[PDB]
Amino acid sequence: GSSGSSGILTENTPVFEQLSVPQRSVGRIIGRGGETIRSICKASGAKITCDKESEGTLLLSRLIKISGTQKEVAAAKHLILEKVSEDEELRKRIAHSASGPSSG
């Protein structure tokens, strides 16, 4: 599933979205200690936070919370991903499990 876009407001109505990220990518999204989550929140303007209700130790997967105006909540969501994909490959470039399509 990929297709599926939409979003309406009055001019800058607030929004609340949540993005579940693995503990393997959260390190690249949030950074060493947030230094990365601080530059994104200011680059998009959307408030980004990490789950709380849960222990948030290292179960299996983490969850992030994005808030703000349709402008940010939408933009920030993109940035957060830009990091998820980075670590996704960064961990593969070092592990390389009988794979690695690098011809083009």
Coordinates of N, CA, C and O in Angstrom, one line a residue:
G1 N 0.8 -1.2 0.0 CA 0.0 0.0 0.0 C 0.8 1.3 0.0 O 1.7 1.4 0.8
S2 N 0.6 2.1 -1.0 CA 1.3 3.4 -1.1 C 0.4 4.6 -1.3 O 0.4 5.5 -0.6
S3 N -0.4 4.5 -2.4 CA -1.3 5.5 -2.8 C -2.2 5.9 -1.6 O -2.6 5.0 -0.8
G4 N -2.7 7.1 -1.6 CA -3.5 7.6 -0.5 C -3.1 8.9 0.1 O -2.4 8.9 1.1
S5 N -3.5 10.0 -0.5 CA -3.1 11.3 0.0 C -4.3 12.2 0.2 O -5.3 12.1 -0.5
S6 N -4.3 13.1 1.2 CA -5.4 14.0 1.5 C -5.1 14.9 2.7 O -4.1 14.6 3.5
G7 N -5.8 15.9 2.8 CA -5.6 16.8 3.9 C -6.3 18.2 3.7 O -5.9 18.9 2.8
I8 N -7.2 18.5 4.6 CA -8.0 19.8 4.5 C -7.9 20.5 5.8 O -7.8 19.9 6.9
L9 N -8.0 21.9 5.7 CA -8.0 22.7 6.9 C -8.7 24.0 6.6 O -9.2 24.3 5.6
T10 N -8.6 24.9 7.6 CA -9.2 26.3 7.5 C -8.2 27.3 7.0 O -8.5 28.4 6.5
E11 N -6.9 27.0 7.3 CA -5.8 27.9 6.9 C -4.5 27.4 7.6 O -3.4 27.8 7.1
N12 N -4.6 26.7 8.7 CA -3.5 26.3 9.5 C -3.9 25.4 10.7 O -3.2 25.3 11.7
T13 N -5.0 24.7 10.5 CA -5.6 23.9 11.5 C -4.5 22.9 12.0 O -3.7 22.3 11.2
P14 N -4.5 22.6 13.3 CA -3.5 21.7 13.9 C -3.8 20.2 13.5 O -4.9 19.9 13.1
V15 N -2.8 19.3 13.7 CA -3.0 17.9 13.3 C -2.2 17.1 14.3 O -1.2 17.5 14.9
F16 N -2.6 15.8 14.4 CA -1.9 14.9 15.3 C -1.7 13.5 14.6 O -2.7 12.8 14.4
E17 N -0.5 13.2 14.2 CA -0.2 11.9 13.6 C 0.8 11.1 14.3 O 1.6 11.7 15.1
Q18 N 0.9 9.8 14.1 CA 1.8 8.9 14.8 C 2.5 8.0 13.8 O 1.9 7.4 12.9
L19 N 3.8 7.9 13.9 CA 4.6 7.0 13.0 C 5.4 6.0 13.8 O 6.3 6.3 14.6
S20 N 5.1 4.7 13.6 CA 5.8 3.6 14.3 C 7.1 3.3 13.6 O 7.2 3.0 12.5
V21 N 8.2 3.5 14.4 CA 9.6 3.2 13.9 C 10.3 2.2 14.7 O 10.2 2.2 16.0
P22 N 11.1 1.3 14.1 CA 11.9 0.3 14.8 C 13.0 0.8 15.6 O 13.5 1.9 15.3
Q23 N 13.4 0.1 16.6 CA 14.5 0.6 17.5 C 15.8 0.6 16.7 O 16.8 1.1 17.2
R24 N 15.8 0.1 15.5 CA 17.0 0.0 14.7 C 17.1 1.3 13.8 O 18.2 1.6 13.4
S25 N 16.0 1.9 13.6 CA 15.9 3.1 12.8 C 15.8 4.4 13.7 O 16.3 5.5 13.3
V26 N 15.1 4.2 14.8 CA 14.9 5.3 15.8 C 16.2 6.0 16.1 O 16.3 7.2 16.4
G27 N 17.3 5.2 16.1 CA 18.6 5.7 16.4 C 19.1 6.7 15.4 O 19.9 7.6 15.7
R28 N 18.7 6.5 14.2 CA 19.1 7.4 13.1 C 18.2 8.6 12.9 O 18.5 9.7 12.5
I29 N 16.9 8.4 13.3 CA 15.9 9.4 13.2 C 16.0 10.4 14.4 O 16.1 11.6 14.1
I30 N 16.1 9.9 15.6 CA 16.3 10.7 16.8 C 17.7 11.2 16.9 O 17.9 12.3 17.5
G31 N 18.6 10.4 16.5 CA 20.0 10.7 16.6 C 20.7 10.1 17.8 O 20.2 9.2 18.4
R32 N 21.9 10.6 18.2 CA 22.6 10.0 19.3 C 21.9 10.3 20.6 O 21.9 9.5 21.5
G33 N 21.2 11.4 20.7 CA 20.5 11.8 21.9 C 19.4 12.8 21.6 O 19.0 13.5 22.5
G34 N 19.0 12.9 20.4 CA 17.9 13.9 20.0 C 18.5 15.0 19.1 O 17.7 15.6 18.4
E35 N 19.8 15.1 19.1 CA 20.4 16.1 18.2 C 19.8 16.1 16.8 O 19.8 17.1 16.1
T36 N 19.3 14.9 16.4 CA 18.7 14.8 15.1 C 17.2 15.1 15.1 O 16.7 15.6 14.1
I37 N 16.6 14.8 16.2 CA 15.1 15.0 16.4 C 14.9 16.5 16.7 O 13.7 16.9 16.6
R38 N 15.9 17.2 17.0 CA 15.8 18.6 17.3 C 15.9 19.5 16.0 O 15.2 20.5 15.9
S39 N 16.8 19.0 15.1 CA 17.0 19.7 13.8 C 15.8 19.5 12.9 O 15.5 20.4 12.1
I40 N 15.1 18.4 13.0 CA 13.9 18.0 12.2 C 12.7 18.8 12.7 O 12.0 19.4 11.8
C41 N 12.5 18.9 14.0 CA 11.3 19.6 14.5 C 11.4 21.1 14.1 O 10.4 21.7 14.0
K42 N 12.6 21.6 14.0 CA 12.8 23.0 13.6 C 12.8 23.2 12.1 O 12.5 24.3 11.6
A43 N 13.1 22.1 11.4 CA 13.1 22.1 9.9 C 11.7 22.0 9.4 O 11.4 22.5 8.3
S44 N 10.9 21.3 10.1 CA 9.5 21.1 9.6 C 8.5 21.9 10.5 O 7.5 22.4 9.9
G45 N 8.8 22.1 11.7 CA 8.0 22.8 12.6 C 7.0 22.0 13.4 O 6.2 22.5 14.2
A46 N 6.9 20.7 13.0 CA 6.0 19.8 13.7 C 6.6 19.2 15.0 O 7.8 18.8 15.0
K47 N 5.9 19.1 16.0 CA 6.3 18.6 17.3 C 6.5 17.1 17.2 O 5.6 16.3 16.9
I48 N 7.7 16.6 17.4 CA 8.0 15.2 17.4 C 8.4 14.7 18.8 O 9.3 15.2 19.4
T49 N 7.8 13.6 19.2 CA 8.1 13.0 20.5 C 8.1 11.4 20.4 O 7.6 10.9 19.4
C50 N 8.6 10.8 21.4 CA 8.7 9.3 21.4 C 7.7 8.8 22.5 O 7.4 9.4 23.5
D51 N 7.2 7.6 22.2 CA 6.2 6.9 23.1 C 6.6 7.2 24.5 O 7.8 7.4 24.8
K52 N 5.6 7.0 25.4 CA 5.8 7.2 26.8 C 5.1 6.2 27.6 O 5.7 5.5 28.5
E53 N 3.8 6.0 27.4 CA 3.0 5.0 28.1 C 3.8 3.7 28.2 O 3.6 2.9 29.2
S54 N 4.6 3.4 27.2 CA 5.4 2.1 27.2 C 6.8 2.4 27.9 O 7.3 3.5 27.9
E55 N 7.4 1.3 28.4 CA 8.7 1.4 29.0 C 9.7 2.2 28.1 O 10.4 3.0 28.6
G56 N 9.6 2.0 26.8 CA 10.5 2.7 25.9 C 11.9 2.3 26.1 O 12.8 3.1 26.0
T57 N 12.2 1.1 26.5 CA 13.6 0.6 26.7 C 14.2 0.1 25.4 O 15.1 0.7 24.9
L58 N 13.7 -1.1 24.9 CA 14.2 -1.7 23.7 C 13.4 -2.9 23.3 O 13.9 -3.8 22.7
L59 N 12.1 -2.9 23.7 CA 11.2 -4.0 23.4 C 11.5 -4.6 22.0 O 12.3 -5.5 21.9
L60 N 10.9 -4.0 21.0 CA 11.1 -4.4 19.6 C 11.1 -3.3 18.6 O 12.0 -3.1 17.8
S61 N 10.0 -2.5 18.7 CA 9.9 -1.3 17.8 C 9.4 -0.1 18.6 O 8.7 -0.2 19.6
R62 N 9.8 1.1 18.2 CA 9.5 2.3 18.8 C 8.4 3.1 18.1 O 8.0 2.7 16.9
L63 N 7.8 4.1 18.7 CA 6.8 4.9 18.1 C 7.0 6.4 18.3 O 7.3 6.8 19.4
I64 N 6.8 7.1 17.2 CA 6.9 8.6 17.3 C 5.6 9.3 17.2 O 4.7 8.8 16.5
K65 N 5.5 10.5 17.7 CA 4.3 11.3 17.6 C 4.6 12.7 17.0 O 5.4 13.4 17.5
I66 N 3.9 12.9 15.8 CA 4.1 14.2 15.1 C 2.8 15.1 15.2 O 1.7 14.6 15.0
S67 N 3.0 16.3 15.6 CA 1.9 17.3 15.7 C 2.3 18.6 15.1 O 3.4 18.9 14.8
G68 N 1.2 19.4 14.9 CA 1.4 20.7 14.2 C 0.4 21.0 13.1 O -0.6 20.3 13.1
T69 N 0.7 22.0 12.3 CA -0.1 22.3 11.2 C 0.1 21.4 10.0 O 1.2 20.9 9.8
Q70 N -1.0 21.2 9.3 CA -1.0 20.4 8.1 C 0.3 20.6 7.3 O 0.8 19.7 6.6
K71 N 0.9 21.8 7.4 CA 2.1 22.1 6.7 C 3.3 21.4 7.3 O 4.1 20.8 6.6
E72 N 3.4 21.3 8.7 CA 4.5 20.7 9.3 C 4.2 19.2 9.4 O 4.9 18.4 8.8
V73 N 3.2 18.8 10.2 CA 2.8 17.4 10.4 C 3.0 16.6 9.1 O 3.3 15.4 9.1
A74 N 2.9 17.3 7.9 CA 3.0 16.7 6.6 C 4.5 16.7 6.2 O 5.0 15.7 5.7
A75 N 5.2 17.8 6.4 CA 6.6 18.0 6.1 C 7.5 17.1 7.0 O 8.3 16.3 6.5
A76 N 7.3 17.3 8.3 CA 8.1 16.6 9.3 C 8.0 15.1 9.0 O 9.0 14.4 9.1
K77 N 6.8 14.6 8.7 CA 6.6 13.1 8.4 C 7.6 12.7 7.4 O 8.1 11.5 7.4
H78 N 7.9 13.5 6.4 CA 8.8 13.2 5.3 C 10.3 13.1 5.9 O 11.0 12.1 5.6
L79 N 10.7 14.1 6.6 CA 12.0 14.1 7.2 C 12.3 12.9 8.0 O 13.3 12.2 7.8
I80 N 11.4 12.6 9.0 CA 11.6 11.5 9.9 C 11.9 10.2 9.0 O 12.7 9.4 9.4
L81 N 11.2 10.1 7.9 CA 11.5 8.9 7.0 C 12.9 9.0 6.4 O 13.5 7.9 6.4
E82 N 13.3 10.1 6.0 CA 14.6 10.3 5.4 C 15.7 9.7 6.2 O 16.7 9.3 5.7
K83 N 15.4 9.5 7.5 CA 16.3 8.9 8.4 C 16.1 7.4 8.5 O 17.1 6.6 8.6
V84 N 14.8 7.0 8.5 CA 14.5 5.6 8.6 C 15.1 4.8 7.4 O 15.6 3.7 7.6
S85 N 15.1 5.4 6.3 CA 15.6 4.8 5.1 C 17.2 4.7 5.1 O 17.8 3.8 4.7
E86 N 17.8 5.8 5.7 CA 19.2 5.8 5.8 C 19.8 4.7 6.6 O 20.6 3.9 6.1
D87 N 19.3 4.5 7.8 CA 19.7 3.4 8.7 C 19.3 2.0 8.1 O 20.1 1.1 8.2
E88 N 18.2 2.0 7.4 CA 17.7 0.8 6.8 C 18.8 0.2 5.8 O 19.0 -1.0 5.8
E89 N 19.5 1.1 5.1 CA 20.5 0.6 4.2 C 21.9 0.6 4.9 O 22.6 -0.3 4.7
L90 N 22.1 1.6 5.7 CA 23.4 1.7 6.4 C 23.7 0.4 7.1 O 24.9 0.0 7.2
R91 N 22.7 -0.2 7.6 CA 22.8 -1.5 8.3 C 23.0 -2.7 7.4 O 23.5 -3.7 7.7
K92 N 22.6 -2.5 6.1 CA 22.7 -3.5 5.1 C 24.0 -3.4 4.4 O 24.6 -4.4 3.9
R93 N 24.5 -2.2 4.3 CA 25.8 -2.0 3.6 C 27.0 -2.6 4.5 O 28.0 -2.9 3.9
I94 N 26.7 -2.7 5.8 CA 27.7 -3.3 6.6 C 27.5 -4.8 6.8 O 28.5 -5.5 7.0
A95 N 26.3 -5.2 6.8 CA 25.9 -6.6 7.0 C 26.1 -7.4 5.7 O 26.7 -8.4 5.6
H96 N 25.4 -6.8 4.6 CA 25.5 -7.4 3.3 C 25.2 -8.9 3.4 O 26.2 -9.7 3.6
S97 N 24.0 -9.3 3.3 CA 23.6 -10.8 3.4 C 23.4 -11.3 2.0 O 22.2 -11.5 1.6
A98 N 24.4 -11.7 1.3 CA 24.4 -12.3 0.0 C 23.4 -11.4 -0.9 O 22.6 -12.0 -1.7
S99 N 23.6 -10.1 -0.8 CA 22.8 -9.2 -1.6 C 23.4 -7.8 -1.7 O 24.4 -7.6 -1.1
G100 N 22.9 -7.0 -2.6 CA 23.5 -5.7 -2.8 C 23.5 -5.3 -4.3 O 24.5 -5.3 -4.9
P101 N 22.3 -4.9 -4.8 CA 22.1 -4.5 -6.2 C 22.7 -3.2 -6.5 O 22.1 -2.2 -6.4
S102 N 24.0 -3.2 -6.8 CA 24.7 -1.9 -7.1 C 25.4 -2.0 -8.5 O 26.6 -2.2 -8.7
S103 N 24.5 -1.7 -9.5 CA 25.0 -1.7 -10.9 C 24.7 -0.4 -11.6 O 25.5 0.0 -12.5
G104 N 23.7 0.3 -11.2 CA 23.3 1.5 -11.8 C 23.7 2.7 -10.9 O 23.4 2.7 -9.7

